[PDB]
Amino acid sequence: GGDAFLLKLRESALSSGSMSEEQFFLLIGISSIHSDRVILAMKDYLVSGHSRKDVCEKYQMNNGYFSTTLGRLTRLNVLVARLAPYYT
Amino acid sequence: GGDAFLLKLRESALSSGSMSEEQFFLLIGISSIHSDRVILAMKDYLVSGHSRKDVCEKYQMNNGYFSTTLGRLTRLNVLVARLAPYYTDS
Known part of the structure:
Protein backbone atom coordinates (compact mmCIF):
# COMPACT_ATOMS: atom_id res chain seq x y z
CA GLY A 1 0.00 0.00 0.00
CA GLY A 2 0.92 3.61 0.67
CA ASP A 3 4.17 3.06 2.54
CA ALA A 4 5.63 0.94 -0.27
CA PHE A 5 4.38 3.50 -2.77
CA LEU A 6 6.37 6.27 -1.11
CA LEU A 7 9.48 4.07 -1.03
CA LYS A 8 9.08 3.44 -4.79
CA LEU A 9 8.87 7.14 -5.46
CA ARG A 10 12.03 7.72 -3.45
CA GLU A 11 13.83 5.03 -5.42
CA SER A 12 12.65 6.32 -8.79
CA ALA A 13 12.84 10.09 -8.13
CA LEU A 14 13.32 12.33 -11.11
CA SER A 15 16.41 14.49 -10.70
CA SER A 16 17.43 17.96 -11.88
CA GLY A 17 18.16 18.16 -15.66
CA SER A 18 16.85 14.61 -16.20
CA MET A 19 14.92 15.34 -19.45
CA SER A 20 14.39 17.29 -22.62
CA GLU A 21 11.69 19.91 -23.02
CA GLU A 22 9.49 17.87 -25.34
CA GLN A 23 9.55 14.80 -23.12
CA PHE A 24 8.64 17.05 -20.18
CA PHE A 25 5.72 18.57 -22.04
CA LYS A 43 10.54 22.72 -16.29
CA ASP A 44 13.31 24.76 -14.71
CA TYR A 45 14.23 21.80 -12.44
CA LEU A 46 13.72 18.80 -14.74
CA VAL A 47 14.69 20.31 -18.08
CA SER A 48 16.95 23.30 -17.39
CA GLY A 49 18.78 21.62 -14.50
CA HIS A 50 18.26 24.35 -11.95
CA SER A 51 18.60 23.33 -8.35
CA ARG A 52 15.62 22.79 -6.09
CA LYS A 53 16.84 25.69 -3.99
CA ASP A 54 16.94 28.06 -6.98
CA VAL A 55 13.59 26.91 -8.33
CA CYS A 56 11.86 27.31 -5.00
CA GLU A 57 13.20 30.86 -4.69
CA LYS A 58 12.20 31.85 -8.20
CA TYR A 59 8.65 30.59 -7.89
CA GLN A 60 8.34 31.26 -4.17
CA MET A 61 7.49 27.65 -3.57
CA ASN A 62 7.74 25.64 -0.36
CA ASN A 63 9.25 22.18 -0.04
CA GLY A 64 5.92 20.40 0.45
CA TYR A 65 4.55 21.72 -2.80
CA ASN A 77 7.52 8.70 -15.36
CA VAL A 78 7.70 5.24 -13.69
CA THR A 88 9.06 0.03 -28.97
CA GLY B 1 -8.22 21.81 -33.05
CA GLY B 2 -11.03 19.79 -31.44
CA ASP B 3 -12.44 18.57 -34.76
CA ALA B 4 -9.08 17.09 -35.89
CA PHE B 5 -8.58 15.63 -32.36
CA LEU B 6 -11.81 13.61 -32.81
CA LEU B 7 -10.75 12.35 -36.26
CA LYS B 8 -7.39 11.27 -34.81
CA LEU B 9 -9.13 9.39 -31.99
CA ARG B 10 -11.23 7.46 -34.51
CA GLU B 11 -8.17 6.36 -36.43
CA SER B 12 -6.35 5.41 -33.26
CA ALA B 13 -9.23 3.77 -31.29
CA LEU B 14 -8.24 0.89 -29.03
CA SER B 15 -9.71 -2.54 -29.89
CA SER B 16 -11.35 -5.15 -27.66
CA GLY B 17 -8.88 -7.81 -26.36
CA SER B 18 -5.83 -5.81 -27.39
CA MET B 19 -3.74 -5.53 -24.26
CA SER B 20 -2.41 -7.38 -21.33
CA GLU B 21 -3.67 -6.67 -17.86
CA GLU B 22 -0.35 -5.08 -16.99
CA GLN B 23 -0.49 -2.66 -19.96
CA PHE B 24 -4.13 -1.88 -19.16
CA PHE B 25 -3.49 -1.06 -15.53
CA LYS B 43 -10.74 -4.06 -18.39
CA ASP B 44 -13.46 -6.37 -19.58
CA TYR B 45 -13.34 -4.73 -23.04
CA LEU B 46 -9.62 -4.11 -23.55
CA VAL B 47 -8.18 -7.14 -21.77
CA SER B 48 -10.92 -9.79 -21.61
CA GLY B 49 -12.38 -9.13 -25.04
CA HIS B 50 -16.02 -8.51 -23.98
CA SER B 51 -18.22 -6.56 -26.41
CA ARG B 52 -19.21 -2.91 -25.79
CA LYS B 53 -22.80 -4.08 -25.41
CA ASP B 54 -21.72 -6.60 -22.79
CA VAL B 55 -19.75 -4.16 -20.64
CA CYS B 56 -22.32 -1.37 -20.81
CA GLU B 57 -24.97 -3.79 -19.55
CA LYS B 58 -22.80 -5.29 -16.86
CA TYR B 59 -21.53 -2.03 -15.47
CA GLN B 60 -24.52 0.23 -16.05
CA MET B 61 -22.88 2.65 -18.51
CA ASN B 62 -24.62 4.52 -21.30
CA ASN B 63 -23.04 4.78 -24.74
CA GLY B 64 -21.63 8.23 -24.17
CA TYR B 65 -19.90 7.09 -20.99
CA ASN B 77 -2.27 5.40 -25.65
CA VAL B 78 -1.31 7.80 -28.48
CA THR B 88 15.12 3.92 -25.38
CA ASP B 89 18.89 3.30 -25.51
CA SER B 90 19.52 6.03 -28.10
Missing part, protein backbone atom coordinates in the same frame (compact mmCIF):
# COMPACT_ATOMS: atom_id res chain seq x y z
CA LEU A 26 4.36 15.19 -23.00
CA LEU A 27 4.49 14.13 -19.32
CA ILE A 28 2.66 17.31 -18.38
CA GLY A 29 0.11 16.53 -21.12
CA ILE A 30 -0.68 13.13 -19.61
CA SER A 31 -0.74 14.53 -16.10
CA SER A 32 -3.51 16.33 -14.23
CA ILE A 33 -1.14 19.19 -13.33
CA HIS A 34 -2.59 22.42 -14.61
CA SER A 35 -0.93 25.23 -12.55
CA ASP A 36 1.31 27.32 -14.89
CA ARG A 37 3.50 28.23 -11.94
CA VAL A 38 4.26 24.63 -10.95
CA ILE A 39 4.72 23.65 -14.64
CA LEU A 40 7.34 26.39 -15.09
CA ALA A 41 9.01 25.43 -11.83
CA MET A 42 9.23 21.78 -12.84
CA PHE A 66 7.79 21.18 -4.71
CA SER A 67 8.24 17.62 -3.40
CA THR A 68 4.58 16.66 -3.96
CA THR A 69 4.70 17.90 -7.52
CA LEU A 70 7.98 16.21 -8.24
CA GLY A 71 6.46 12.99 -6.82
CA ARG A 72 3.47 13.27 -9.16
CA LEU A 73 5.79 13.53 -12.13
CA THR A 74 8.06 10.73 -10.81
CA ARG A 75 4.97 8.49 -10.55
CA LEU A 76 3.96 9.23 -14.11
CA LEU A 79 4.40 4.25 -15.34
CA VAL A 80 5.48 5.53 -18.73
CA ALA A 81 8.83 3.72 -18.47
CA ARG A 82 6.95 0.51 -17.66
CA LEU A 83 4.67 1.10 -20.63
CA ALA A 84 7.48 1.86 -23.09
CA PRO A 85 8.35 -1.74 -24.04
CA TYR A 86 4.77 -2.21 -25.33
CA TYR A 87 5.40 0.53 -27.94
CA LEU B 26 -0.53 1.08 -16.37
CA LEU B 27 -2.70 3.14 -18.73
CA ILE B 28 -5.43 3.35 -16.04
CA GLY B 29 -2.74 4.41 -13.62
CA ILE B 30 -1.76 7.39 -15.76
CA SER B 31 -5.39 8.30 -16.36
CA SER B 32 -7.74 10.33 -14.25
CA ILE B 33 -10.42 7.59 -14.49
CA HIS B 34 -11.81 7.24 -10.97
CA SER B 35 -14.96 5.07 -11.24
CA ASP B 36 -14.34 1.46 -10.07
CA ARG B 37 -17.11 0.13 -12.30
CA VAL B 38 -15.75 2.07 -15.27
CA ILE B 39 -12.25 0.63 -14.75
CA LEU B 40 -13.73 -2.87 -14.61
CA ALA B 41 -15.78 -2.24 -17.76
CA MET B 42 -12.70 -1.05 -19.65
CA PHE B 66 -18.37 4.11 -22.72
CA SER B 67 -17.31 6.02 -25.83
CA THR B 68 -15.85 8.91 -23.82
CA THR B 69 -13.94 6.53 -21.53
CA LEU B 70 -12.54 4.58 -24.47
CA GLY B 71 -11.60 7.94 -26.06
CA ARG B 72 -9.74 8.97 -22.89
CA LEU B 73 -7.70 5.77 -22.97
CA THR B 74 -7.14 6.03 -26.75
CA ARG B 75 -5.68 9.56 -26.24
CA LEU B 76 -3.36 8.26 -23.49
CA LEU B 79 0.59 10.06 -26.04
CA VAL B 80 2.42 7.20 -24.39
CA ALA B 81 3.49 5.92 -27.80
CA ARG B 82 4.94 9.40 -28.51
CA LEU B 83 6.77 9.30 -25.16
CA ALA B 84 8.20 5.80 -25.60
CA PRO B 85 11.24 6.75 -27.75
CA TYR B 86 12.56 8.84 -24.82
CA TYR B 87 12.86 5.63 -22.78
Whole structure:
Protein backbone atom coordinates (compact mmCIF):
# COMPACT_ATOMS: atom_id res chain seq x y z
CA GLY A 1 0.00 0.00 0.00
CA GLY A 2 0.92 3.61 0.67
CA ASP A 3 4.17 3.06 2.54
CA ALA A 4 5.63 0.94 -0.27
CA PHE A 5 4.38 3.50 -2.77
CA LEU A 6 6.37 6.27 -1.11
CA LEU A 7 9.48 4.07 -1.03
CA LYS A 8 9.08 3.44 -4.79
CA LEU A 9 8.87 7.14 -5.46
CA ARG A 10 12.03 7.72 -3.45
CA GLU A 11 13.83 5.03 -5.42
CA SER A 12 12.65 6.32 -8.79
CA ALA A 13 12.84 10.09 -8.13
CA LEU A 14 13.32 12.33 -11.11
CA SER A 15 16.41 14.49 -10.70
CA SER A 16 17.43 17.96 -11.88
CA GLY A 17 18.16 18.16 -15.66
CA SER A 18 16.85 14.61 -16.20
CA MET A 19 14.92 15.34 -19.45
CA SER A 20 14.39 17.29 -22.62
CA GLU A 21 11.69 19.91 -23.02
CA GLU A 22 9.49 17.87 -25.34
CA GLN A 23 9.55 14.80 -23.12
CA PHE A 24 8.64 17.05 -20.18
CA PHE A 25 5.72 18.57 -22.04
CA LEU A 26 4.36 15.19 -23.00
CA LEU A 27 4.49 14.13 -19.32
CA ILE A 28 2.66 17.31 -18.38
CA GLY A 29 0.11 16.53 -21.12
CA ILE A 30 -0.68 13.13 -19.61
CA SER A 31 -0.74 14.53 -16.10
CA SER A 32 -3.51 16.33 -14.23
CA ILE A 33 -1.14 19.19 -13.33
CA HIS A 34 -2.59 22.42 -14.61
CA SER A 35 -0.93 25.23 -12.55
CA ASP A 36 1.31 27.32 -14.89
CA ARG A 37 3.50 28.23 -11.94
CA VAL A 38 4.26 24.63 -10.95
CA ILE A 39 4.72 23.65 -14.64
CA LEU A 40 7.34 26.39 -15.09
CA ALA A 41 9.01 25.43 -11.83
CA MET A 42 9.23 21.78 -12.84
CA LYS A 43 10.54 22.72 -16.29
CA ASP A 44 13.31 24.76 -14.71
CA TYR A 45 14.23 21.80 -12.44
CA LEU A 46 13.72 18.80 -14.74
CA VAL A 47 14.69 20.31 -18.08
CA SER A 48 16.95 23.30 -17.39
CA GLY A 49 18.78 21.62 -14.50
CA HIS A 50 18.26 24.35 -11.95
CA SER A 51 18.60 23.33 -8.35
CA ARG A 52 15.62 22.79 -6.09
CA LYS A 53 16.84 25.69 -3.99
CA ASP A 54 16.94 28.06 -6.98
CA VAL A 55 13.59 26.91 -8.33
CA CYS A 56 11.86 27.31 -5.00
CA GLU A 57 13.20 30.86 -4.69
CA LYS A 58 12.20 31.85 -8.20
CA TYR A 59 8.65 30.59 -7.89
CA GLN A 60 8.34 31.26 -4.17
CA MET A 61 7.49 27.65 -3.57
CA ASN A 62 7.74 25.64 -0.36
CA ASN A 63 9.25 22.18 -0.04
CA GLY A 64 5.92 20.40 0.45
CA TYR A 65 4.55 21.72 -2.80
CA PHE A 66 7.79 21.18 -4.71
CA SER A 67 8.24 17.62 -3.40
CA THR A 68 4.58 16.66 -3.96
CA THR A 69 4.70 17.90 -7.52
CA LEU A 70 7.98 16.21 -8.24
CA GLY A 71 6.46 12.99 -6.82
CA ARG A 72 3.47 13.27 -9.16
CA LEU A 73 5.79 13.53 -12.13
CA THR A 74 8.06 10.73 -10.81
CA ARG A 75 4.97 8.49 -10.55
CA LEU A 76 3.96 9.23 -14.11
CA ASN A 77 7.52 8.70 -15.36
CA VAL A 78 7.70 5.24 -13.69
CA LEU A 79 4.40 4.25 -15.34
CA VAL A 80 5.48 5.53 -18.73
CA ALA A 81 8.83 3.72 -18.47
CA ARG A 82 6.95 0.51 -17.66
CA LEU A 83 4.67 1.10 -20.63
CA ALA A 84 7.48 1.86 -23.09
CA PRO A 85 8.35 -1.74 -24.04
CA TYR A 86 4.77 -2.21 -25.33
CA TYR A 87 5.40 0.53 -27.94
CA THR A 88 9.06 0.03 -28.97
CA GLY B 1 -8.22 21.81 -33.05
CA GLY B 2 -11.03 19.79 -31.44
CA ASP B 3 -12.44 18.57 -34.76
CA ALA B 4 -9.08 17.09 -35.89
CA PHE B 5 -8.58 15.63 -32.36
CA LEU B 6 -11.81 13.61 -32.81
CA LEU B 7 -10.75 12.35 -36.26
CA LYS B 8 -7.39 11.27 -34.81
CA LEU B 9 -9.13 9.39 -31.99
CA ARG B 10 -11.23 7.46 -34.51
CA GLU B 11 -8.17 6.36 -36.43
CA SER B 12 -6.35 5.41 -33.26
CA ALA B 13 -9.23 3.77 -31.29
CA LEU B 14 -8.24 0.89 -29.03
CA SER B 15 -9.71 -2.54 -29.89
CA SER B 16 -11.35 -5.15 -27.66
CA GLY B 17 -8.88 -7.81 -26.36
CA SER B 18 -5.83 -5.81 -27.39
CA MET B 19 -3.74 -5.53 -24.26
CA SER B 20 -2.41 -7.38 -21.33
CA GLU B 21 -3.67 -6.67 -17.86
CA GLU B 22 -0.35 -5.08 -16.99
CA GLN B 23 -0.49 -2.66 -19.96
CA PHE B 24 -4.13 -1.88 -19.16
CA PHE B 25 -3.49 -1.06 -15.53
CA LEU B 26 -0.53 1.08 -16.37
CA LEU B 27 -2.70 3.14 -18.73
CA ILE B 28 -5.43 3.35 -16.04
CA GLY B 29 -2.74 4.41 -13.62
CA ILE B 30 -1.76 7.39 -15.76
CA SER B 31 -5.39 8.30 -16.36
CA SER B 32 -7.74 10.33 -14.25
CA ILE B 33 -10.42 7.59 -14.49
CA HIS B 34 -11.81 7.24 -10.97
CA SER B 35 -14.96 5.07 -11.24
CA ASP B 36 -14.34 1.46 -10.07
CA ARG B 37 -17.11 0.13 -12.30
CA VAL B 38 -15.75 2.07 -15.27
CA ILE B 39 -12.25 0.63 -14.75
CA LEU B 40 -13.73 -2.87 -14.61
CA ALA B 41 -15.78 -2.24 -17.76
CA MET B 42 -12.70 -1.05 -19.65
CA LYS B 43 -10.74 -4.06 -18.39
CA ASP B 44 -13.46 -6.37 -19.58
CA TYR B 45 -13.34 -4.73 -23.04
CA LEU B 46 -9.62 -4.11 -23.55
CA VAL B 47 -8.18 -7.14 -21.77
CA SER B 48 -10.92 -9.79 -21.61
CA GLY B 49 -12.38 -9.13 -25.04
CA HIS B 50 -16.02 -8.51 -23.98
CA SER B 51 -18.22 -6.56 -26.41
CA ARG B 52 -19.21 -2.91 -25.79
CA LYS B 53 -22.80 -4.08 -25.41
CA ASP B 54 -21.72 -6.60 -22.79
CA VAL B 55 -19.75 -4.16 -20.64
CA CYS B 56 -22.32 -1.37 -20.81
CA GLU B 57 -24.97 -3.79 -19.55
CA LYS B 58 -22.80 -5.29 -16.86
CA TYR B 59 -21.53 -2.03 -15.47
CA GLN B 60 -24.52 0.23 -16.05
CA MET B 61 -22.88 2.65 -18.51
CA ASN B 62 -24.62 4.52 -21.30
CA ASN B 63 -23.04 4.78 -24.74
CA GLY B 64 -21.63 8.23 -24.17
CA TYR B 65 -19.90 7.09 -20.99
CA PHE B 66 -18.37 4.11 -22.72
CA SER B 67 -17.31 6.02 -25.83
CA THR B 68 -15.85 8.91 -23.82
CA THR B 69 -13.94 6.53 -21.53
CA LEU B 70 -12.54 4.58 -24.47
CA GLY B 71 -11.60 7.94 -26.06
CA ARG B 72 -9.74 8.97 -22.89
CA LEU B 73 -7.70 5.77 -22.97
CA THR B 74 -7.14 6.03 -26.75
CA ARG B 75 -5.68 9.56 -26.24
CA LEU B 76 -3.36 8.26 -23.49
CA ASN B 77 -2.27 5.40 -25.65
CA VAL B 78 -1.31 7.80 -28.48
CA LEU B 79 0.59 10.06 -26.04
CA VAL B 80 2.42 7.20 -24.39
CA ALA B 81 3.49 5.92 -27.80
CA ARG B 82 4.94 9.40 -28.51
CA LEU B 83 6.77 9.30 -25.16
CA ALA B 84 8.20 5.80 -25.60
CA PRO B 85 11.24 6.75 -27.75
CA TYR B 86 12.56 8.84 -24.82
CA TYR B 87 12.86 5.63 -22.78
CA THR B 88 15.12 3.92 -25.38
CA ASP B 89 18.89 3.30 -25.51
CA SER B 90 19.52 6.03 -28.10
